[PDB]
Amino acid sequence: EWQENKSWNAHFTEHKSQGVVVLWNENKQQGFTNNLKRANQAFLAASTFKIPNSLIALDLGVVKDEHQVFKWDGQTRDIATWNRDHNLITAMKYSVVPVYQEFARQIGEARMSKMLHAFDYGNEDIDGGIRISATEQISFLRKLYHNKLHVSERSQRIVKQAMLTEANGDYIIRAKTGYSTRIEPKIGWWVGWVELDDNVWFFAMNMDMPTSDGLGLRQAITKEVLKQEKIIP
Amino acid sequence: EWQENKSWNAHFTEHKSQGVVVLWNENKQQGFTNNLKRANQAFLAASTFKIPNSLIALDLGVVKDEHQVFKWDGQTRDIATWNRDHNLITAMKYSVVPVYQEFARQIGEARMSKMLHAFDYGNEDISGNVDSFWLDGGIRISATEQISFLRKLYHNKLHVSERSQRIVKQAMLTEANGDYIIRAKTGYSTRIEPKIGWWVGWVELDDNVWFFAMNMDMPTSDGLGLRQAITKEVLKQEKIIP
Ligand SMILES: *C(=O)N1C[C@H](NOS(=O)(=O)O)CC[C@H]1C(N)=O
Ligand SMILES: *C(=O)N1C[C@H](NOS(=O)(=O)O)CC[C@H]1C(N)=O
Ligand SMILES: [Cl-]
Ligand SMILES: [Cl-]
Ligand SMILES: [Cl-]
């Protein structure tokens, strides 16, 4: 079922980094990773939690649709793109914590907890202190892709639209980045999938990310693994 | 409201070409074109008809969802990518005429006509073969009418389900990066003169949407890439895309 291909470690050491990439070939129901241990370690979800939070906000009506505006509160924060109005699409694009904090307040602790349980999300059992492994990310995302989660079809299609990250004639990537900072080890996340004409390859990676300047490596290393496996040109 | 910008013709003449680009700025409700007259001239929809066709097929249940497979019928056709199975996503990507001619037959004349009137689509005339009227029948639509139709799709205001509308917009996905998303559909009218090339859709920005529609004289297939290239040259000139 799962195969460990340590040759991928080269793409982490090339950039003097340590981390994991987990791939899942949907057609063949086979998985691949460079590090079976780290594939199954649970790290803090950080921004990748915006995926279940979006779904829950939509299904409960807290977010009416992807065009609804969420006004900046006029408090300047360190990330300039946050200091403006947003809709669901822009808020995911720029990973706008204060907007998603608001969704969570309105959702409330009790319903948030009931729905993450319906989703079987994270390792924890019952980022709001949610730990989740890369392989657990894939399993959650496979449910999203197939519209199997316990929310409406509409909520799931809207979130998949908001995860749109890249598209050309060769592939479509839906995905979400994350950077976990408040507890060592500081790590970057990138989770999602790449759509091809007649297959889907799910992915989930995280990597030690001590500073901040390395954050591009999250996509870059993931793509080197995809190119090595001829999943993308 | 409407403004003519003739400077855009340089992009056509530099390719020895004639055509029109129309742009609609959604926030400001203003339009821009190099040729008001040709913007309002109605042509055969050709493969741009796959948008309304997809919507109707989905709403009527002819297409269950974007994963349903339409097996190739064994008949080897000229375009190699047509000679294989498809779903709605791939069928739109490769503009797979025979899949859509099957849709049209299942839809039938009456429901196709009724729907196009509900859509207020072009001249709403399906006269001819039900599975080719958009290629060599009576249907006619202008660039400004494509935009008007696309804007109704963009706001989920067509008289079909929201779901139908969301699935079709997924299948129109063409390009996406950190700067913009293009949802569009190409066309090439080839059977009835004047031969023209189409490209219609929109550019999603963070805080605005620019709808577009261009057609251009297309004597030969050698120039088909110009549809996108001229449109992007206009978009770059107007600082819509880098
Ligand atoms: C998510 O983990 N966060 C929100 C924001 N950007 O996340 S992303 O670029 O990795 O997608 C900043 C970092 C981080 C946070 N401050 O909690
Ligand atoms: C649509 O106008 N057509 C279908 C097919 N797609 O070419 S496209 O790249 O312009 O969409 C070939 C051209 C044309 C046709 N001959 O039916
Ligand atoms: Cl929104
Ligand atoms: Cl999409
Ligand atoms: Cl429907």
Author numbering:
A (entry chain A): 24 to 149, 159 to 265
B (entry chain B): 24 to 265
Paper text:
In contrast to the majority of carbapenemases, OXA-48-like carbapenemases have low activity toward carbapenems and show no significant hydrolysis of extended-spectrum cephalosporins, including CAZ. Here, we report the occurrence of single (OXA-48:P68A) and double (OXA-48:P68A,Y211S) amino acid substitutions within OXA-48 as a response to CAZ and CAZ-AVI exposure, respectively. The antimicrobial susceptibility data and enzyme kinetics showed that the P68A substitution was responsible for an increased activity toward CAZ, whereas P68A,Y211S led to a decrease in the inhibitory activity of AVI. X-ray crystallography structures revealed that OXA-48:P68A leads to increased flexibility within the OXA-48 structure, likely contributing to elevated CAZ hydrolysis.
Two new crystal structures of OXA-48:P68A were obtained after soaking. The second OXA-48:P68A structure was in complex with AVI (OXA-48:P68A-AVI) and resolved to 2.22 Å. Furthermore, we found AVI covalently bound to S70 in all OXA-48:P68A-AVI chains. R214 and the Ω-loop were in the same conformation as in the native OXA-48. For OXA-48:P68A, we observed no change in the inhibitory activity of AVI. In addition, Y211 in OXA-48 stabilizes AVI binding by aromatic stacking. In addition, S211 contributes to the reduced inhibitory activity of AVI by the loss of aromatic stacking, which stabilizes AVI in OXA-48 and OXA-48:P68A.
